[PDB]
Amino acid sequence: SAAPLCVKVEFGGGAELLFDGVKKHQVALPGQEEPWDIRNLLVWIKKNLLKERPELFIQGDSVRPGILVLINDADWELLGELDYQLQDQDSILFISTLHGG
DSSP states (O other): OOOOOEEEEEEOOOOOOOOOOTOOOEOOOSSSSSSOOOHHHHHHIIIOOSSOOOGSSOOSSSSSSSSEEEETTTHHHHHHTSSSSOTTTOOOEEEEETTTO
């Protein structure tokens, strides 16, 4: 529960297997500066949650060409991706398109 706005970070493109199988990660914004940009959250996930080696995961700023991200439910890159001041109830989903089927 975030007083201002709260966002959800989750894995879908088999990305969870890089993190042992945990997909949904909830993160509440402070209510002032909001340092929880997509950029910083990937870092939080990369450094802490990456059980694999990040070499198969995304680049440490937003995503690699391999994993795509939905900001709330839309194309991250066109929206601002890495440098996002977050939006309310953003469903931030990492979808690795390196393996679609």
